[model samples]
Target: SGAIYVGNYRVVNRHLATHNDWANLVWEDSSRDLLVSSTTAQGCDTIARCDCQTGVYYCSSRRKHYPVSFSKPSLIFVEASEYYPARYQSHLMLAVGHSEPGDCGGILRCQHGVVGIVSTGGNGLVGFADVRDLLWLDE
Candidate 1:
């Protein structure tokens, strides 16, 4: 097992688990976070896609953040470089303040000055907007 880096976070290299076939995961949005509401109901959290028809789910201790309604199989970048599409996405880039090199300043206020998601992607970064409205981070 290894770690697959994506944006600011990384997916640990290890097959954890996958949701059952065609499972519909329960998602909820609260305050500034979005997460799996219930993994016990009909759908399980995504771990691995066993095939085109079935997928596997594994129990994990590490907490992860997902954008609202972003439930699907956990993606592994180590195995393949598949380009999955998202209707909307959130990102985390190291923050640089206004006029500072590598700054996300004027774009997002660059408040934290760290390089920096999905609803919005979780934890590492956050945001909610249509693709057109999120072009400010242009490097």
Candidate 2:
């Protein structure tokens, strides 16, 4: 029902899941031809696609992009809890043990391409919803 601006795109659609603490936002560009480099649809794979030491870019709460190296193996487990009751299997989530606060809904990217979207974080850990599985509601 409302829209917010993030970097160069405007979020036109938003979706929240009842089963977990995950949300997806659809972005739109006025030019209708936002030029983005091609990224693999498989998300991140340290063994095949990206290296375990790959660097990632994510926006902070201050709307500034910063680079951070991926945590060993890149992915992490987030146990099901009262807040996010759905059990997330491995490779479904990406984590970065960064102390800086990340902006929710911001894009996470690396040299391998788009990793995921920022979801939640605390205690020097940031979690993201893998982009490969995100439901494209806008399409």
Candidate 3:
């Protein structure tokens, strides 16, 4: 049998507040549209950002999402993920990565400090994401 569900948006209002108010998105507009291709996506899901402040989700070959950050201090990326205070250059990337239910793709920091998701490959571990950067978890 099938089931029905709804987002208790109240529980997610905090996430919505930050997303809805981001009138001036800082990230570069991706020309390539990233679509999610997973069976886990809800029927209401579309090709937009649910948590744009820290992460962006989409459908394609699989459910792909990413942790986004800003290079400026004035603009703070507010969401459920960790954050890095202070600031960095436009070309430099502040440590960020993915985190799911069981997978601790990220490390929780008590100091509210930025915990760089140090990838084995140094230099912009997350890299500069664009429209072409599709979030994928594999099938």
Candidate 4:
């Protein structure tokens, strides 16, 4: 149990409870402004692959206009994608106005609930890993 530097703060690290091929779960302190209130839901909505939906993402990078005290949140449209040949499980994707490498851990929340966390992307497209299951382990 130690703290790691991220963005502009030293976020206290907790258990890395889950880390599979698709997603990861890292426990952290919730008192900081970096933590966004998440909605409790079993999973994302029945969104078809390639379909677009509006959502919010909390960006943790240096940018103009936003307050320097905390992470910036932006409302953007997110697209759903099927995991390659296994069209069963789906992941979320979106395009940020100002994408940054530090935005990987940003949270993506939709109408259904907290869909996933930003995993990887480039060239304007940002992909998320489905972490709905990991939410259940927070006991």
TM-scores of the models, in the given order? 0.18, 0.43, 0.19, 0.37
lDDT of 1 by residue, 44-92 (tens): 2122211121111111212222212212223222111122233222222
lDDT of prediction 1: 0.21
Cα TM-score of candidate 2:
0.43
Name the lDDT value of residue 96 in candidate 3: 49
Q: Report the C-alpha lDDT of model 2 over 37-118, residue by residue, as the tens digit.
A: 2222322222123443444645555545666655433334455434344443343344555423325556666665555555
Model 3 lDDT tens row, 4-112: 1112111111112234323322222111111122223333312222222243322121245444552211222222233223332122223344433222122211122
* Highest-scoring model, lDDT: 2
Poorly placed runs, candidate 3 (over 4 Å): 1-45, 49-51, 56-95, 98-121, 132-139
For model 1, the stretches where C-alpha displacement exceeds 4 angstroms are 1-17, 21-24, 28-37, 40-80, 85-88, 95-139
- Candidates 2 and 4 compared by lDDT, better number: 2
1 or 4, which is superior by lDDT?
4
Worst 10 residues of 4 by lDDT: 13-22
How far residue 86's Cα lies from its native spot in candidate 3, in Å, is 29
C-alpha lDDT of candidate 4 relative to the true structure = 0.36
Model 4, span 8-108: residue lDDT tens: 22221112212331132233322111222222234323322222245565556643222111123333233332312212223334444444555655555
Candidate order (TM-score)? 2, 4, 3, 1
lDDT (CA) per prediction: 0.21, 0.40, 0.23, 0.36
Give the winner by lDDT: 1 or 3.
3
